[PDB]
Paper text:
Voltage-gated sodium (NaV) channels initiate and propagate action potentials in excitable cells and play important roles in health and disease. NaV channels contain 24-transmembrane segments linked in four homologous domains (DI-DIV), where four peripheral voltage-sensor domains (VSD1-4) surround a central ion-conducting pore module that houses the ion selectivity filter and key ligand and toxin binding sites. The NaV1.7 channel is expressed predominantly in the peripheral nervous system, and genetic studies have identified compelling loss-of-function and gain-of-function phenotypes in human pain syndromes, prompting significant efforts to develop NaV1.7-selective inhibitors as potential novel analgesic drugs. Thus, we sought to exploit an engineered human VSD4-NaV1.7-NaVPas cockroach channel chimeric construct that had been previously shown to complex with small molecule inhibitors and peptide toxins known to target VSD4.
Seeking to leverage existing knowledge of the arylsulfonamide binding pocket, GNE-9296 (compound 2) was synthesized in an attempt to directly graft on a significant portion of the GNE-3565 scaffold. Gratifyingly, this molecule retained substantial potency, affording channel blockade at an IC50 of 47 nM (n = 8). A cryo-EM structure of GNE-9296 bound to the VSD4 NaV1.7-NaVPas channel confirmed that the molecule adopts the desired hybrid binding mode. Here, the anionic group of the novel hybrid compound binds in the same position as in the aryl and acyl poses, interacting closely with R4, as seen for the aryl-like binding. The aryl- and acylsulfonamide-derived structural motifs of GNE-9296 occupy their expected positions in the pockets formed between S2/S3 and S3/S4, respectively. Further analysis of the cryo-EM structure of GNE-9296 revealed that the aryl ring in the S2/S3 binding pocket was shifted ~1 Å away from the VSD4 core compared to arylsulfonamides such as GNE-3565 (data not shown). (G) FSC between two half datasets yields a global resolution estimate of approximately 3.1 Å resolution from the refinement using an overall mask of the VSD4-NaV1.7-NaVPas channel bound to GNE-9296 (compound 2). These hybrid molecules bridge both the S2/S3 and S3/S4 helical gaps, with the anionic moiety situated centrally, interacting with the arginine gating charge network within the core of the domain.
Residue numbers in the entry:
A (entry chain B): 13 to 57
B (entry chain A): 129 to 218, 224 to 430, 515 to 600, 608 to 745, 842 to 1154, 1157 to 1257, 1260 to 1437
Write the structure that this text describes.
């Protein structure tokens, strides 16, 4: 598994991460990265 | 010599050489000055002197009829050359050299029409200027009388009884009260809150007393009614609707809610009437110029077309579905769909090119557009070219008839539009250069005067900011920039900004509106029931019942539960009204029958009300609390009686015939705003987040570079309330931008925006302003100004039909008919003088010298009124009172002499009657002024307004002012009907907003004084919102859904949370119905009548012509 803010495709995201002092769940979202372009990264729900 | 000068002067090469030199000079004025710029100014001055020498040796100086200085163009050029040499020999003067750039207007073809229209409008505005000065002066005097020092009211802490400040003495109390540290102010506020002891005004916290005459006025002391100059500035600001909600709220918080009446008058008379006169003058000027200009003089089968149309619509929908923070499945779908769409487009292009021979295929414009799209798509998937994807949306124009016709109209008359836009941008460039030169250094030299010593976001530091500030003023916001300019500058800021407002807003934008207008324009029972239905008394009774119950419905405020009697009255009225509605529906069903009852829209409305009330009654019988929204539907019965008012038929007919066009324009605007909103989403999605601390303050990028650093320091990663995260948010933010309300914050977040998950930096992305500018041109100056044009056309037609005129008659025939009808009614009259002494008085009175002397006396009395100010000694007040006594005595002498001279003939003339009434009022005032003031100050101040009566005589004798006032008087009934419709709409929205947002917690524009708790406060808010002023704050308050506690039905707590969806529906519907439809009606009405008057005084006969004829006869 890989950490927060890393490329992922919805099936390889860790359940939770101890990032910024709380156990935060992680889901692989996909965030704006240009015009009609987006980078898919693992971030907390 | 002379031969050479003539031969060289008229060659086009010389003209184009000079024009290129001027354009280069403009480009160099944009950039900062250096040594290179100095030498290049010398070069440019040399070129201009060569030009001037050539021209003068060609023609002469002034002597000849066609000398050098006989043309204003040469006057401008020669004056600017003189000024350039003066600046070289010996700073503020060197800005105006930019005026040379005006010559560039001649490059664009078709410029003569626009220049002539502009010049005609300016020359025609003279009489309007006189009337504007008079009306603004009258309103400034009224405001000075009403709000003198009211904006200095402050909450002062009581003198402490603990004795820390010491044993009380009058000096000690004054010393404590004057200290600024004892005035109430909430933390982080920059201005002291206003207070007032009148009912409904701002209250002070416990231990605080509302005092007057301490501290400074709001906004660095620039917003007050303390002097006639300041009152004049405030009145002009209120007339222009520039940030007027702030002054409106300050005045009502210091004085009391009833003073709303004042703002109603100035807004109605100043905004809905005069600015419409300016618009009418501009429309006539442009129409005259255009009239003169005109006088001078498989793959090729419908199924495939439908398939590609639906594919295009699907592609537009998927492009709109893009947004921030998506999941992987969604974007995989979207990208796959984009690939499929590109594949379909390639197949379309190849099948067309093969089926239809290549030579003919590229001939069609739409085919080449399609091929351009295909090339851009193949490049995009080859490899930012993804912006060009937006072009696909315009493909829908081929298939949408209305949009196609809109685009065809725009393409038909592009020349005039480009000329107007070029003139607008050239004027903006000239004003930006002048402001950059005049106010450039002051913002830097005197930064300390600013609230934090920090440069404000809008300034004149560089060319880009100067252009932005001037463009903002042209949009309509000039008072705040003027405040900052005065803070760092001097008086010169006032004429500048104000000038920018006239030229840009009231002349150029009105001219663009004028272009838009020119181009886009069992037997027993049934018998008894029919008899009872047609009966007049029964209908009046029903209307009275409806109106009484509707008015009662406005008493249901936040205090209703504390009035048990009112609750009982409400409940019993609900039951009686249910019975009444059932009986009335039964009577109407016996009268007209089922078929005609259920095919009428009004009877649908009545039936819906009946169903809602029966539902509520069965709920109350079942023990369920009544739905309030359902029982608020009875107000909707007020519209049928409202439509039956005398003269109201024209307004409602106009509105019902304008609904289809308004809907079509709304659809087209939705399309264009969809394009702009997709672009905004792609530009600013996810980039409005920022790091904030416990206090809602943004942090420096030095301390928090991004979200990781933000959260490591236990901070908040907060999103801006208005953003472009998806298409709906982009719609709402673009609505804020186009209406010019809340746009400042949106552009600030927009230009501080950086990559996602990064801290915004002040003005790191300045050029993003461009994005908004374009939108404001194509979404506000064009799409939002079509409603008024549609209304103008339809109201013109409707008034023609209302008056019985045939649709086929031409304007000259109508003017001839109006002249003939005027000639039908006319009679002479003669007076007889005395007896010798009385005859001598008669001869004295009739003489025009007497009228001019009275004219002068009235002017002097008006000036004496202007001299009054706050803080003047009691001696000065006594002296002014005695001067006014002298003037009253003189006017009373006038009345005595005229009565003696004219005997009973004095009262034949209406203005004589006005003078008589005014004189009697002034005499009674001399009797009662001593008594009234001694026995509330407000009562004396309000009753002293009758003083204004004897300076209103100044309008008597004017010709153009009389012409405008006659136009206004012919349109008074229609204007009153429009206002009554507006007030009924406001009543409906007030009751519904009282139901919805009566418990929301204080936020934004909503506070203790301004909210929906009572009907009066709701009406105050809705009157403010009917002009679209300050609706961003109201939206923020009523759409808030965070940190709100839900209602507890068991405990009876109603809640304090808002509703974003309900807030959006309420506010957007109100803005569309009032700001874009009903308010614009005013302009429509005005223009028609004004035009009707002007063509009488220009190409026809006017009542003054007959007046002269009968005075002679
Ligand atoms: C016109 C109707 C006026 C109705 C006013 C209702 C007054 C009721 C009331 O409560 O008074 C409010 C209040 C005083 O309150 P206080 O007694 O201080 O409160 C103490 C704490 N309770 O009254 C006001 O200020 C009323 C203000 C009305 C302003 C009207 C201005 C409109 C413009 C008028 C222009 C006139 C021009 C004349 C031209 C010449 C004509 C020939
Ligand atoms: C000699 N002694 C008569 C003067 C000096 C001593 C104190 C009293 C007086 N001082 C003075 C105060 C104000 C004005 S003023 O110029 O400010 N006011 C007006 O003239 C004016 C005032 C009022 Cl109350 C007014 O009543 C309204 C009418 C409407 C219906 C019935 C009442 C009409 C007026 F014209 C004025 F000249 C005179
Ligand atoms: C027919 C058209 C052309 C004109 C409509 C008339 C308006 C000028 C009227 C209608 C309702 C009136 C409002 C009804 C209720 C109030 C509340 C009133 O203040 C109070 O409630 C005083 C008590 C308190 O504040 O404690 C102040 C006047 C005001 C806003 C009125 C001001 C004048 C209004 C807007
Ligand atoms: C309870 C909690 O959040 N504590 C943290 C602390 O561990 C950390 O060292 C500090 C950084 O300034 O922020 C806070
Ligand atoms: C206001 O009160 C504070 C508190 O003692 C004092 O320091 C200050 O000097 C006072 N202001 C003036 C102008 O004296
Ligand atoms: C908010 O401002 C106060 C005073 O300006 C300051 O203590 C801090 O910046 C914020 N408050 C707290 C408790 O941190
Ligand atoms: C976040 O900031 C902390 C503090 O310096 C640093 O140790 C950490 O590596 C950073 N993580 C990321 C993903 O930037």
């Amino acid at each position: 598994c890989k950490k927060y803010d890393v490329e992922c495709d919805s099936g390889e995201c860790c359940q939770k991460q101890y990032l910024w002092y709380k156990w935060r769940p992680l889901d692989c979202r996909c965030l704006k990265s240009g015009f009609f372009s987006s980078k898919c990264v693992c971030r907390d729900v | 010599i002379r031969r050479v000068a003539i031969s060289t002067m008229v060659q086009p090469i010389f003209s184009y050489f000079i024009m290129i030199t001027i354009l280069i000079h403009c480009i160099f004025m944009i950039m900062p000055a250096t040594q290179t710029t100095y030498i290049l100014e010398l070069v440019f001055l040399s070129i201009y002197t060569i030009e001037v020498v050539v021209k003068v040796l060609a023609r002469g100086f002034i002597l000849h009829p066609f000398a050098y200085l006989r043309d204003p163009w040469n006057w401008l050029d020669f004056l600017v050359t003189l000024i350039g040499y003066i600046t070289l020999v010996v700073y503020a003067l060197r800005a105006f050299r930019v005026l040379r750039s005006w010559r560039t207007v001649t490059i664009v073809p078709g410029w003569r029409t626009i220049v002539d229209a502009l010049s005609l409008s300016i020359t025609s505005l003279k009489d309007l200027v006189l009337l504007l000065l008079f009306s603004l002066s009258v309103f400034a005097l009224i405001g000075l009388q009403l709000f003198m020092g009211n904006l200095k009211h402050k909450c002062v802490k009581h003198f402490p009884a603990d004795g820390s400040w010491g044993n009380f003495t009058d000096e000690r109390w004054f010393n404590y009260t004057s200290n600024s540290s004892h005035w109430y102010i909430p933390d982080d506020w920059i201005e002291y809150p206003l207070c007032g002891n009148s009912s409904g005004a701002g209250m002070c916290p416990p231990g605080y007393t509302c005092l007057q005459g301490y501290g400074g006025n709001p906004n660095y002391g620039y917003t007050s009614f303390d002097t006639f100059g300041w009152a004049f500035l405030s009145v002009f600001r209120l007339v222009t609707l520039d940030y007027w909600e702030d002054l409106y709220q300050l005045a009502l918080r210091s004085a009391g809610p009833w003073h709303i009446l004042f703002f109603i008058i100035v807004v109605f008379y100043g905004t809905f009437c005069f600015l419409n006169f300016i618009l009418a003058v501009v429309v006539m000027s442009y129409t005259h110029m255009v009239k003169r200009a005109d006088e001078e003089k498989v793959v090729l089968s419908p199924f495939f077309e439908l398939f590609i149309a639906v594919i295009i619509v699907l592609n537009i929908t998927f492009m709109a579905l893009d947004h921030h923070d998506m999941n992987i499945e969604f974007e995989r779908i979207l990208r796959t769909g984009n690939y499929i769409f590109t594949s379909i487009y390639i197949v379309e292009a190849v099948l067309k090119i093969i089926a239809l021979s290549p030579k003919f295929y590229f001939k069609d414009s739409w085919n080449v557009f399609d091929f351009i799209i295909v090339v851009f798509a193949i490049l995009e998937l080859g490899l930012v070219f993804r912006s060009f994807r937006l072009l696909r949306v315009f493909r829908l124009a081929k298939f949408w008839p209305t949009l196609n016709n809109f685009m065809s109209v725009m393409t038909k008359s592009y020349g005039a539009f480009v000329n107007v836009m070029y003139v607008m941008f050239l004027l903006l460039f000239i004003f930006a250069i002048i402001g950059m030169q005049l106010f450039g250094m002051n913002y830097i030299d005197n930064m300390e005067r600013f609230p934090d010593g920090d440069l404000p976001r809008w300034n004149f530091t560089d060319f880009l900011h100067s252009f932005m500030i001037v463009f903002r003023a042209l949009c309509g916001e000039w008072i705040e920039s003027m405040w900052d300019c005065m803070l760092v500058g001097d008086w010169s800021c006032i004429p500048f900004f104000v000038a920018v407002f006239f030229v840009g807003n009231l002349v150029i934008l009105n001219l663009l509106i004028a272009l838009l207008l020119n181009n886009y324009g069992w037997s027993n029972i049934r018998r008894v029931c029919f008899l009872l239905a047609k009966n007049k008394y029964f209908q009046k009774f029903v209307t009275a019942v409806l109106v009484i119950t509707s008015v009662l419905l406005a008493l249901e405020d936040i205090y209703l539960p504390q009035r048990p009697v009112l609750v009982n009255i409400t409940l019993y009225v609900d039951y009686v009204l249910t019975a009444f509605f059932v009986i009335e529906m039964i009577i109407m069903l016996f009268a007209v029958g089922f078929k005609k009852y259920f095919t009428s829209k009004w009877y649908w409305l009545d039936f819906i009300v009946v169903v809602a009330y029966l539902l509520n009654f069965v709920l109350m019988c079942a023990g369920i609390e009544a739905l309030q929204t359902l029982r608020l539907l009875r107000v909707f019965r007020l519209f049928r009686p409202l439509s039956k008012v005398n003269g109201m038929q024209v307004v409602t007919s106009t509105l019902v015939e304008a609904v289809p066009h308004i809907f079509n324009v709304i659809l087209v605007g939705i399309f264009f705003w969809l394009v702009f909103a997709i672009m905004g989403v792609q530009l600013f999605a996810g980039k409005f987040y920022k790091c904030v601390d416990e206090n809602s303050t943004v942090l420096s990028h030095e301390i928090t570079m991004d979200r990781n650093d933000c959260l490591h320091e236990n901070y908040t990663w907060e999103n801006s309330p208005m953003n472009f995260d998806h298409v709906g948010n982009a719609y709402l933010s673009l609505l804020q931008v186009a209406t010019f309300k809340g746009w400042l914050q949106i552009m600030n977040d927009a230009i501080d925006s950086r990559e996602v998950h990064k801290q915004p930096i002040r003005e790191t992305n300045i050029y993003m302003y461009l994005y908004f500018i374009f939108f404001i041109v194509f979404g506000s100056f064009f799409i939002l100004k079509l409603f008024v044009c549609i209304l103008i056309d339809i109201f013109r037609q409707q008034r023609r039909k209302a008056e019985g005129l045939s649709a086929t008659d031409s304007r000259t025939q109508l003017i001839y008919r109006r002249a003939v009808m005027r000639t039908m009614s006319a009679k002479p009259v003669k007076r007889i003088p005395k007896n010798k002494i009385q005859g001598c008085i008669f001869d004295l009175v009739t003489n025009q010298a007497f009228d001019i002397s009275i004219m002068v006396l009235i002017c002097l009395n008006m000036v004496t009124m202007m001299v009054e100010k706050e803080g003047q000694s009691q001696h000065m007040t006594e002296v002014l009172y005695w001067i006014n006594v002298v003037f009253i005595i003189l006017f009373t002498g006038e009345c005595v002499l005229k009565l003696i001279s004219l005997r009973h003939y004095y009262f034949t003339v209406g203005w004589n009657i006005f003078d008589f009434v005014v004189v009697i009022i002034s005499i009674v005032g001399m009797f009662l002024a001593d008594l009234i003031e001694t026995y509330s100050p407000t009562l004396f101040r309000v009753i002293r307004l009758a003083r204004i009566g004897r300076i209103l005589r100044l309008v008597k004798g004017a010709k153009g002012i009389r012409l405008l006032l006659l136009a206004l008087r012919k349109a008074l009934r229609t204007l009153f009907n429009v206002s009554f419709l507006l007030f009924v709409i406001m009543f409906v929205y007030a009751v519904f907003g009282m139901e919805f947002f009566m418990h929301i917690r204080d936020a934004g524009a909503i506070d203790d004084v301004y909210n929906f708790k009572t009907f009066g406060q709701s009406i105050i808010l809705l009157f403010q919102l009917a002009t679209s002023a300050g609706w961003d704050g109201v939206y923020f308050a009523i759409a808030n859904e965070e940190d709100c506690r839900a209602p507890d039905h068991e405990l009876g707590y109603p809640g304090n949370c808002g509703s974003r969806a309900l807030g959006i529906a309420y506010l957007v519907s109100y803005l569309i119905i009032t700001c874009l439809v009903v308010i614009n009606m005013y302009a429509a009405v005005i223009l028609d009548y004004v035009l009707e008057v002007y063509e009488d005084s220009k190409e026809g006969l006017t009542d003054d012509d007959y007046d002269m004829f009968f005075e002679v006869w």
